UniProtKB/Swiss-Prot annotation, chain A:
GO terms for biological process: cell wall macromolecule catabolic process; defense response to bacterium; defense response to Gram-negative bacterium; defense response to Gram-positive bacterium; killing of cells of another organism. It comes from the Eukaryota. Residues 1-129 form the C-type lysozyme domain. Keywords: Allergen, Antimicrobial, Bacteriolytic enzyme, Disulfide bond, Glycosidase, Hydrolase, Secreted, Signal. One of its GO terms (molecular function) is identical protein binding. This is Lysozyme C. It is found in: Secreted. GO terms for cellular component: cytoplasm; endoplasmic reticulum; extracellular space. Substrate binds at residue 101. It comes from Gallus gallus. Belongs to the glycosyl hydrolase 22 family.
């Protein structure tokens, strides 16, 4: 499922991602846009045998288990298939565990190079909430 | 001094603190180390979001020359200017006893 921009903003605000660990809601909308283009079924290979899954591109070496990545830690304790659901509940709960791991939203490469230090609130301007 | 994109900044006879140069599109970094000309190597990875560009390699043998390699893990189709693996050599010091 490919979320709409405002549709995703309301869904993530319902999950309490606004100002979670100091990151306003616009950060998470922008992060999903440049990580997965709002696609819940996005899958991308890495160069180390791992894979990023879901609308937030959760990595299969550190966070979820996909059964094919060597030395996977699965610190979110969840199968990567659960992060490919049209329901973003699993991807949000794992994202909260990641951002609270002490490095903030720097774990998402697309957020670092496209959203950090920008007008992230533009991604929620004109939505319901 | 000339910039060094990979270097040891602190060392003990059995441990090394390496520092390297980061790049914007790196998800994390892989660290490969083993005895120079040895028959086996060890690979480890840093965690996403860790922008300290530092890591400790421990459990090494004193007086042995090691080859340390650091490379940026990227997403396929999102590599861009990422240079690739860089390597250095470092022979650990003898132990006090």
């Amino acid at each position: 499922k490919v979320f709409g921009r405002c549709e995703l903003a309301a869904a993530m605000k319902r999950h309490g991602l606004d100002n979670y660990r100091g990151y306003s809601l616009g950060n998470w909308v922008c992060a999903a846009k440049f990580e997965s283009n709002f696609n819940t079924q996005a899958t991308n290979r890495n160069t180390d045998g791992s894979t990023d899954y879901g609308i937030l591109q959760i990595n299969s070496r550190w966070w979820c288990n996909d059964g094919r990545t060597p030395g996977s830690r699965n610190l979110c304790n969840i199968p990567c298939s659960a992060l490919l659901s049209s329901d973003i509940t699993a991807s949000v709960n794992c994202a909260k565990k990641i951002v609270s791991d002490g490095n903030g939203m720097n774990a998402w490469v697309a957020w670092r190079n496209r959203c950090k230090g920008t007008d992230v609130q533009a991604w929620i301007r004109g939505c319901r909430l | 001094d000339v910039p060094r994109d990979l270097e040891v900044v602190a060392a003990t006879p059995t441990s090394l603190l390496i520092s390297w140069r980061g790049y914007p599109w790196a998800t994390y970094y892989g660290i490969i180390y083993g005895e120079t000309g040895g028959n086996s190597l060890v690979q480890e990875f840093t965690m996403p979001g860790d922008l300290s560009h530092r890591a400790t390699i421990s459990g090494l043998k004193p007086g042995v020359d090691y080859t340390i390699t650091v490379y940026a893990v990227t997403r396929v189709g999102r590599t861009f200017d990422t240079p690739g693996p860089i390597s250095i050599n470092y022979r650990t010091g003898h132990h006090h006893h």
